[PDB]
């Protein structure tokens, strides 16, 4: 793939078919922010800690 495709990376999938799979097809997805990411940008909000 081209480097500008990896920049603002799209979802690239690996779909393989074999006899031994449960549903006979499996899928793995990688992009810039999943496969060996440089940074882990996460926003973690908790609301109503008192509960009900």
């Amino acid at each position: 793939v081209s480097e500008e495709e990896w920049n603002t990376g799209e979802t690239y999938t690996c779909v393989v078919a074999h006899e031994a799979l449960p549903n006979r097809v499996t899928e793995r997805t990688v992009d810039k922010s999943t496969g060996k990411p440089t940074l882990y940008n996460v926003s973690l909000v908790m609301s109503d800690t008192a509960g009900t």
């Binding site: 109503d48 008192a50 509960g51 009900t52």
Partner: protein, 53 residues
């Protein structure tokens, strides 16, 4: 009437003499005796009240 007179508990009577019935009407009012100290608890609102808004 003054306060300590009411706390003492003296009997008080009202005289009622209405026109058609010359017979007066008499009643007795007195303060009974008997004292436990109240305990005051102020319950905060439930967290569900804060949830509803």
């Amino acid at each position: 009437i003054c306060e300590d007179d009411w706390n003492s508990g003296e009997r008080f009577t009202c005289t009622v003499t209405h026109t058609d019935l010359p017979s007066p009407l008499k009643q007795t009012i007195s303060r009974p005796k008997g004292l436990h100290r109240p305990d005051v608890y102020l319950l905060p609102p439930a967290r569900e009240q804060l949830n509803l808004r």
